[PDB]
């Protein structure tokens, strides 16, 4: 009933430790929200964009641990805006495995700083909101310590941003999101 896609920031500002946590988090999410009618997709980004598995591939091999294990860090700059636009056009495409009528949910796990991205959020948010793509932001590193990073997260997360922005170190957040996922 729902199409969930994962977008993880793997720039140079991403410490291997936290990148690992991202992978662990994603796997735990796919192992916790393992429903008979739920597919997953994951695309990592930096200056480039690498899809590791589409909704179709996950439908062929429903092994989260096996799909997240070979995932390597890209490194480089950050393209959160350019990434969001690509996610709503390629990741959520029927050809890749996206279903019709099903809800669109995008989980964005960025470093907090979209540096080097030629596109702004104003160029991609109005697009993601039209296609009906719910946004959930998970902050890592110092994303909650800086003002610029905090507001950025609130610009990606669907309003109200407070109820859509969680910490990567917040384990209870998973139960919280899964809760709101009932009042979709």
């Amino acid at each position: 009933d729902s199409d969930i896609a994962f977008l993880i920031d793997g720039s140079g500002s991403i410490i291997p430790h936290d990148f690992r946590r991202m992978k662990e988090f994603v796997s735990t999410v796919m192992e916790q929200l393992k429903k008979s009618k739920t597919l997953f997709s994951l695309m990592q980004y930096s200056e480039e964009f690498r899809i590791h598995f589409t909704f179709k591939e996950f439908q062929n091999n429903p092994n989260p641990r096996s799909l997240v294990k070979p995932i390597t860090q890209l490194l480089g700059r950050t393209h959160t805006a350019t990434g969001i636009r690509k996610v709503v056009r390629e990741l959520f495409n029927i050809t890749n495995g996206a279903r019709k009528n099903a809800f669109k949910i995008l989980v964005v796990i960025t470093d907090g700083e979209k540096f080097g991205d030629p596109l702004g959020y104003e160029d991609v948010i109005p697009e993601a909101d039209r296609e009906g793509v719910i946004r959930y932001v998970i902050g890592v590193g110092d994303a909650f310590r800086s003002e610029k990073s905090r507001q950025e997260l609130n610009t990606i997360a669907s309003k109200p941003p407070r109820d859509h922005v969680f910490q990567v170190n917040n384990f209870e957040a998973l139960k919280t999101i899964q809760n709101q996922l009932r009042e979709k």
């Binding site: 140079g12 500002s13 950050t78 907090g112 590193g141 800086s146 990073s149």
Partner: protein
């Protein structure tokens, strides 16, 4: 040479001055990145060459 420099906003470590090239009469040192920041996605290594006469301006 009309090339300036790179981003100095990153904490680098300049090691190895290397052998002086008796061809170009210059010497090249290597700078390695030891720590970056969120609002600063810097490179892992940099290279800088200077005259063997050791001129600094």
């Amino acid at each position: 040479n009309w090339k300036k420099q790179f981003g100095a906003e990153c904490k680098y470590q300049f090691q190895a001055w290397g052998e002086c090239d008796l061809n170009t009469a210059l010497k090249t040192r290597t700078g390695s990145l030891k720590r970056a920041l969120h609002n600063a996605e810097c490179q892992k290594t940099v290279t800088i060459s200077k005259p063997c006469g050791k001129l600094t301006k």
